[PDB]
Design a binder for this molecule. Sequence first.
Ligand SMILES: [Mg+2]
Ligand SMILES: [Mg+2]
Ligand SMILES: [Mg+2]
Ligand SMILES: [Mg+2]
Lengths: 103, 72
Amino acid sequence: MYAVFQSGGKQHRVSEGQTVRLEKLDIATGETVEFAEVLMIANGEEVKIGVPFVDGGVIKAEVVAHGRGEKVKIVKFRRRKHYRKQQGHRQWFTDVKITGISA
Amino acid sequence: MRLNTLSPAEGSKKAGKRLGRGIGSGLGKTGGRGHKGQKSRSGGGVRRGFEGGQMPLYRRLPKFGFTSRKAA
Ligand SMILES: [Mg+2]
Ligand SMILES: [Mg+2]
Ligand SMILES: [Mg+2]
Ligand SMILES: [Mg+2]
């Protein structure tokens, strides 16, 4: 049994027990988050969306951790032009563990 | 009030331009002098009053008057 939901402007196909990394959410570590906009649920049979989101689809998840991703280095350079600039970046994330998928 | 606690007033001490020390500084390479010409050369530049070869203002205008000595 898997389901599709949208979180931080992106979509994820998940199943119960799977850990998924999302964009930073404003919830505490031990709290439970519910995603009510489920694009599709497929167990034995598949439930699509006449209109976006299945009628009674709810995905329950527990926040696991908040952190920053690996450092990326931005390099800008203009040859023969006496111009150079460097910058670093670490993107915030939120890991959640899928607990239950409700049809 | 200790010798490792005294601080200058804000704005009193400005740093100072250091030319030719890299791109990041903003004064690297040419050091604010532009490209070529007399004004970019070491010890280069024209004297006070020079306007090219055009007769300068202080020589285009006539002299006038005299010093009194009684005014002093
Ligand atoms: Mg510049
Ligand atoms: Mg040159
Ligand atoms: Mg030239
Ligand atoms: Mg010049």
